[PDB]
């Protein structure tokens, strides 16, 4: 069963979109009511455990198609919307606890809400990934959800962050590096699901070894991305990434050893299996430092060792094959160093699904927009 660390959802101040005098005429007034309601509904859905990706997709597009009117021009004879600065938006952040941040920009709202949707996808994903039975249909769903979240994060980062007038404090979700980390964790996580599938389907060891190794590199890269932050808020997360890295380095060594065995290198294979078991033991160390490290989001546990099942199988086959050469329980002619892994994964690597916001709601007409009078 899967274990994925999760930081808490962002929270936001209620927005009524009630502008009083600024609003003149029924058209502009109804569009403000629909903004109010479509935002409220989307926010309610975040904490709803009966929410699936169909409902979230609908609610999000409804709200975003309206919100877009505060951002993009209609006739496009104007740079942007005149309402972009009308409203102050306040959001908490995944690592920052109860200390919120506020900007009066519609873009900040767009990015923050969109960031929370992606977040919601990773949570729906891990909620499902943690169930026991876990049919194949549910696995695609988890895999797909994680890739959708990736696309949203990536899109927000490249096509949106630059538009902001106010750069976010380092350590906030709207900082570029933080978003890159979320992208990479989403890919790494989707690949975990593919690794479990590859293993139950009994694919080639080299394929699984390459995928495990590439996955550990993503975690290492995500960790390197969060390295530029402050230890107080970012420490727990980074420990989890380091832990994952040990977990999947241990898998790579396990399945590499089967490769070395099939090529009749007994000493090298033995050494490589020893490394797998060592790394996994150190991974069980880092696991406790992780559970004892103060930081945002609850602590998760691996349990569930399918590793020792494979290892026991490799060991018996290796000892039967390699004894009379390297020895029975006391091993001779073993390389002093573990093999240095360079592995290319040709199968299983995950791309984020390209994402785009819906086009501005047709409910935004020049007449409606004109009924907004700022003075």
């Amino acid at each position: 069963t899967h274990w994925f660390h999760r930081n808490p959802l962002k929270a936001t101040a209620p927005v009524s979109f009630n502008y009083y005098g600024v609003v003149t005429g029924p058209s502009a007034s109804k569009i403000c009511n629909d903004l109010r309601s479509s935002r409220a509904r989307l926010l309610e859905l975040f904490t709803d455990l009966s929410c699936n990706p169909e409902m979230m997709k609908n609610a999000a597009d409804s709200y975003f198609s309206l919100l877009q009117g505060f951002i993009n021009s209609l006739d496009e004879s104007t740079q942007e919307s005149k309402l972009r600065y009308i409203q102050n938006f306040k959001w908490t952040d995944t690592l920052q606890g109860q200390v919120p941040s506020a900007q009066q920009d519609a873009v900040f709202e767009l990015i923050s809400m969109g960031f929370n949707v992606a977040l919601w996808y990773t949570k729906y994903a891990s909620r499902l990934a943690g169930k026991e039975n876990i049919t194949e249909d549910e696995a695609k769903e988890v895999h797909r959800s994680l890739k959708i979240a990736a696309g949203i994060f990536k899109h927000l980062k490249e096509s949106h962050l630059p538009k902001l007038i106010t750069p976010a404090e380092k350590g906030r979700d709207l900082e570029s590096r933080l978003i890159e980390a979320y992208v990479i964790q989403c890919q790494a996580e989707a690949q975990e699901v593919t690794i479990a599938r590859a293993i139950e389907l009994k694919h080639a060891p080299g394929l699984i070894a390459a995928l495990a190794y590439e996955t550990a590199n993503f975690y290492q890269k995500a960790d390197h991305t969060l390295s530029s932050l402050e230890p107080a808020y970012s420490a727990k997360w980074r420990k989890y990434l380091h832990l994952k890295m040990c977990f999947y380095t241990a898998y790579a060594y396990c399945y590499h050893g089967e490769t070395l065995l099939a090529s009749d290198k007994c000493g090298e294979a033995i050494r490589s299996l020893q490394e797998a078991e060592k790394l996994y033991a150190k991974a069980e160390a880092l696991c406790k430092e992780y559970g004892e490290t103060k930081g945002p989001g609850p602590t998760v546990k691996p349990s569930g060792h399918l590793f020792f099942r494979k290892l026991g199988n490799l060991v018996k086959n290796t000892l039967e094959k390699c004894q009379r050469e390297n020895g029975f329980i006391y091993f001779q002619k073993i390389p002093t160093e573990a093999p240095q892994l360079e592995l290319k994964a040709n199968y299983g690597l995950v791309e984020p699904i390209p994402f785009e916001f819906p086009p501005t709601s047709v409910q935004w007409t020049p007449e409606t927009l004109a009924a907004f009078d700022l003075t």
Partner: peptide
């Protein structure tokens, strides 16, 4: 679905066998 080398692949990107 096939990859660039013409290998049949599944939903998860693994070789379809």
């Amino acid at each position: 679905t096939k990859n660039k080398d013409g290998v049949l692949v599944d939903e998860f990107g693994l070789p379809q066998i």
